[PDB]
Amino acid sequence: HHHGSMQILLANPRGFCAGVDRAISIVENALAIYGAPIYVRHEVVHNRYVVDSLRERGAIFIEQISEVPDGAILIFSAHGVSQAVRNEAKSRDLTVFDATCPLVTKVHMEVARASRRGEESILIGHAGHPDVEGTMGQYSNPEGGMYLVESPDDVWKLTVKNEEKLSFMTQTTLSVDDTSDVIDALRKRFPKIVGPRKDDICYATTNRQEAVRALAEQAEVVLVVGSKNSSNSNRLAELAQRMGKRAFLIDDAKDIQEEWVKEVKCVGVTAGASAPDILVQNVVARLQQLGGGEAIPLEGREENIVFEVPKELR
């Protein structure tokens, strides 16, 4: 467990955010209260261990509301659903509980409010991601418009109907440094545009990036615990890599390759927002097998935010 060659450092904060803790408990609590099966639309969170653990408990993960039988209980995932998907669930004989992150619902509601006013909306976000369908699918007014931008270059190439009546929003897990450049480009291009002071990047995302930066100034190699389809986890690995360090996104301790830490003197470990602590604890045990000493957590920003389950799920 505890003395050896290679130092192990743990980023702070790392691992579960308020939204993911809430989402998991909505699924656990529905299973404990109503019994298996409970249907969840898509993975509740982008972590295969969390998804497999709930499956064991009796959660059924489906792709389409059309796979859910009448009379069932269905949960929307933490990443949110479009208005279409919600109405479709409303039209069916189903009890729905919604695990959408409150901080995502926040962004959904600003897109819906723009549609109602005929204002065009720009989302900063990555194409071909689940969170994006959800958020873009809050916009329904055909007089207006809804556009996705990924880069300052996309802002420069964008053409809009009425630059005078424009709003922007952003996904919640994006790279803070890269979103800042995009928003600077938007506000210069469109100085009357309205959006939030800074972005709609959530506190967990911002904190985990700040922590991985601090981590990555000290360690040669960075391990980010999270699944390949977790965009926040991926942003953490990428930050470290962009600081010139080898950085590995790993689902669990078994993905660790001895070469990655051969002759390494400081290895840093973090966890995306959907990765449970038992995964990190297993990584640390594996790193110790490989010569690591005691894991030292870095000092870090305190997080104190909690989102409660719906009262009917306590």
Residues that bind ligand F3S (CB under 6 A): 17-20, 78, 101, 103-104, 172-173, 202, 204-205, 232, 273
DSSP conformational letter for 194: B
Cis check: omega of the bond before 196, within 30 degrees of 0:
no
* Residue number, 97 or 190, with CB nearest to ligand F3S: 97
Determine, following the binding rule CB under 6 A, whether residue 270 of this chain makes contact with ligand H6P. Answer: no
Cβ(234)–Cβ(51) below 8 Å: no
Rounded distance, CA 107 to CA 118, Å? 17
Angle at the Cα of 276 from the Cα atoms of 275 and 281, rounded to 5 degrees: 110
Among 135, 173, 179, 288, binds ligand H6P (CB under 6 A): 173
DSSP alpha helix (H) spans, 159-222: 176-189, 203-216
> Which tokens sit at 229?
């389809």
Cβ(68)–Cβ(40) below 8 Å: no
* Residue number, 12 or 232, with CB nearest to ligand H6P: 232
* Residue number, 130 or 300, with CB nearest to ligand H6P: 130
* Residue number, 78 or 216, with CB nearest to ligand H6P: 78
CB of 149 to ligand H6P, least distance (A): 18
Rounded distance, CA 202 to CA 273, Å? 11
Residue 88 pairs with which residues in a beta bridge? Answer: none
User: Which residues, numbered 214-233, are part of the site for ligand H6P (CB under 6 A)?
Assistant: 230-233
31 binds, among ligand F3S, ligand H6P, none (CB under 5 to 8 A by kind): none
DSSP conformational letter for 69: P
Closest to 125 in 3D by CA, of 85, 178, 163? 178
Going residue by residue from 62 to 81, which x/- string records binding to ligand H6P, judged by CB under 6 A?
----------------xx--
User: Which residues, numbered 12-51, are part of the site for ligand H6P (CB under 6 A)?
Assistant: 19-20, 45-46
Closest to 134 in 3D by CA, of 159, 109, 151? 109
Angle at the Cα of 201 from the Cα atoms of 182 and 25, rounded to 5 degrees: 150
Determine, following the binding rule CB under 6 A, whether residue 104 of this chain makes contact with ligand H6P. Answer: yes
Total residues binding ligand H6P (CB under 6 A): 18
CB of 120 to ligand F3S, least distance (A): 24
26 binds, among ligand F3S, ligand H6P, none (CB under 5 to 8 A by kind): none
* Residue number, 182 or 271, with CB nearest to ligand F3S: 271
* Residue number, 12 or 170, with CB nearest to ligand H6P: 170
- Site for ligand H6P, rule CB under 6 A: 19-20, 45-46, 78-79, 101, 104, 131, 172-173, 230-233, 272-274
